[model samples]
Target: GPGGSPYLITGIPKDPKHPLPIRKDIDDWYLEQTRIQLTLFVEALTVIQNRPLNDQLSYFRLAGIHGAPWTEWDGVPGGQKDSKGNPTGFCVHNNYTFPTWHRVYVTLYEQVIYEAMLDFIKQNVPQNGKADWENEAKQWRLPYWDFARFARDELRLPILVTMPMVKVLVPGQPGKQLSKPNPLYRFQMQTLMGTLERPYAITSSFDLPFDKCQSTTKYGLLENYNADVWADGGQNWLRANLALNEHPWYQNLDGWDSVPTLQDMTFRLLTTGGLNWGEFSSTRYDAPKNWMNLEAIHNNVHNWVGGFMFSRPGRHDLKLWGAGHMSSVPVAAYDPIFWLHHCNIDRLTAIWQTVNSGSWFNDDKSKVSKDDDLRPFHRFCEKTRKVVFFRSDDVKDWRSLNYDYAITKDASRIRKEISDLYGQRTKEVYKDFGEEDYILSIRYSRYALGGKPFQINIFFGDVDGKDFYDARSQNFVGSVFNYSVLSVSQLPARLAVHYYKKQNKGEVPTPRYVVVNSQGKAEAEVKVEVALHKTEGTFYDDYRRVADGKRAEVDDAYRA
Candidate 1:
């Protein structure tokens, strides 16, 4: 088979005044022609999925570019192994290029799918509706799942993605309803690539052997194939148990705090000042630290979506527990939801770029520079008419890539919406902005707690760290998730302590940290620092440590 040329080389043409088709939020895309177009997208998706594994644009090969098999794609060398015996794939993680690499990657996917949709419409549309169908296909773009945003009154996975069957109008056929297996639910592997059991993932385990996997699984499906992982009925118990705050079942759910925390973190990342590209872009250990960054918050979504068990954050011994494909970096893209999740991540990048205009990564600090070409994804240079790799610098502007997020409101409006949705707690806690405030800063080795995903729960009053019930306690302020692999990387997170301070008449209340590892055990080694600083202050210059014993206090709490 010949190597595929730059597929859909030039991006979807960008019109300055008119712009390209807007990528709608998934839930907002269920009306009229737009809904039909979505069905057509699935039709195109099936076409691509059915392509032979050797085809560069096949769903398997495209997804493989992320991780697994360690095979070279195009001219990129991903077959090589790192010092840790991990694949040195083109997939950039824990770096400034994390967001940009994915941005280009997602754009490549969009272009291929867009082209497929056009082809499908051309072949299937009736002669009478050819012009109308063509026009509809032109306005189609990939829809994003806004996971951070709560749905109406509950927080659960979208029903559209979870339902095994969906009612869709057969494309090219007029208004004919057809019941088909949902493409979004899972990626049907046309050709099995054989089982790829990662030797390095000692703490966690995959739900099914890749060779034996007929399709993907999430949450409950990881353990029980027949279980409805995303059923709203099971989630109803979460809301129903809200009054019974002490109930362990409600507290044990992995994403109990996802509703408010995700929005709040996004608000903080966008509004916070003194952020450079390296610091704002990734979870890289050496980059300037913040309470949260684009990658930091994004990491938690991966774990939550992939059925990461919160009951056990990490494992001290080599014991296997079922893990979903989304939980691991190498195989995450194989899940259909990975694309939607990354699209939303790219949307956040665009929003952040708008908030902090004319800022970029300092090339010296990053493994890949903005000028460096991101392999496996290329664009046709208009002047040269030659294929060229897309660089991080090339994608700095969303307009250049020929797509934009539908949510282009003023920053103030976005801020207000965030506050209204997730800031109600902050609003009730803080009456006025003070000259100075304190932050409980915690730093821990990402690999320290068995090198698997874990979390830090911060509380105000004396709450039992050993028991799961304390999470619902009024003293519970906020939490941080170290959703990185076991390696030599450090994470810095700031906890919201203003509420405790204000309530106790301007005194810092008792701060207790319950360090939970991947096994859901409370054991970790970390450096905790509490600092006071003025609002909108710099990290290094403005933050002043309150006490030396305070640092020891956090460590003591971990041991306790």
Candidate 2:
């Protein structure tokens, strides 16, 4: 029942009188957090910029951002709002969104810091040193631009940047509940497929070759330089040796046996089959709570990174952007990494199309029997009336439509190697808990890998009792205790409740619940009541207000 299709309401449940109610306390807290995060990001970039080529690569490897909140969700504290307090129409959830949002926010923060760094360099470094740093920045631009260009040319996808526009239709609305089977959903599916196949058009100046006057080197430090080189070199070595052992393709190529090119290997692994890029589209729009699918993608991407690649390689450095994961925050803003990653994905798709000789174009032609005929249940246009349509053949020449990907045959091998190294490293980095086996044994009656399954297990413990009236009878209190493990194959996850002994006489004690996935993964859990209940008048009014973008007045609510 937990995993069954249901039209569930998401977003803020209550509406406020004021759409943008400013909660000074919470606002201050969020701002402070942003300030700190931005500072660290800028500092890291500065260090990378100042270091030698080898050192720059090392810095990325050592501190590459990875882990849950980062790997599982796109962007930090996802979601964004526009200046008018209206939801800026973006969502963040998937791992892709994580880097996208963070990149933009971090960039915005860095822009301010860049100005300060410029001034500092002007005052501290001699004119000659400054000139040297400027030249270095220009040189660094080659790889930076190449990175973006490579993504565009190879992936044929867009990085997650701006927040996507979405509309929440309440129950009993004018038409229908916009289920997956709806025509609009199908149209969206087609549009997404087309979009994913589009080539990356390098647009950002940052992707351009660095120019001496425009590029400055102020962030590099002696310590950071050492760390950067060590990280990059170590990762490269591991990737080359590992790939040689796993795949036979690497054995015959020149320099393939030892010290293989990082970038080339990375590109190969990402474009390879078995890692479902298409499935990502489905999961983003449907079955979001299915953690197994989510983990698969995470593992796939991470493994791609462990090897050699020209691009920077720190797990922490990669971020996501979009609707689901971190960007789920109702009022958060978009970040830059979103665009970069999407663009990179687009580039990869483009390259894949060329490499496979337009295999991407082979769709069900009968589905489009007539050129003018629209398919059933399709709506590619955005809510804001933005048109979305494209021919598969035209995806590669996307730049003629106002963009061009940045890629060259020379870097192909390097790119593929990098992808492979990344994949290998991911396995090394993520550690599994050994106790997971024991917990699984005690918690379930029976476990099956696939097919329909049902389970309910109880543990002895104390529970908190709450009173509530039944559907049509007298009110009664239901016992609440931490003594049960409920799981459903449909849900593919488990929930565990824990009770602690009371420490004092007058305290109202309650048990705690921990939620775990099928892999025995666990995370913090909270309890809330669910029932067939209805509220009238002000309740509905408040709900609409929040949906309409009214900020709530709860203590510290509207700070960020």
Best by lDDT: 1
Give each prediction's root-mean-square deviation over alpha carbons.
Answer: 6.6, 26.1
**lDDT, candidate 2, 212-315, per-residue tens:** 11111111111213333321121121221232222212123343231122222333224443323222211121111111222122222222222111221123
TM-score between model 1 and native: 0.76
lDDT of each: 0.57, 0.22
Error in Å for residue 341 of model 2? 12
Per-residue accuracy of model 1 over 1-560 as CA lDDT, tens digit each: 13544454455655444456677777777433435576677788888877776677787778878876556676566666656554455788776788999998888788888778878877876788766666656677777877656554334455467666777676556778787777777776533335333321212122233444445545322332333332211112122122112111222445333224455456566666767777778766552235457886777677656644423332224222334567666667877888998988898888778767756775356635667777877667777887888878788876676777755545557656555644554334233434343454455566554345565555655554334222353455455556552211112223334444455686655546566554445553554333332234322225555422122123233342
lDDT for model 2, please.
Answer: 0.22
lDDT of 1 at 169: 71
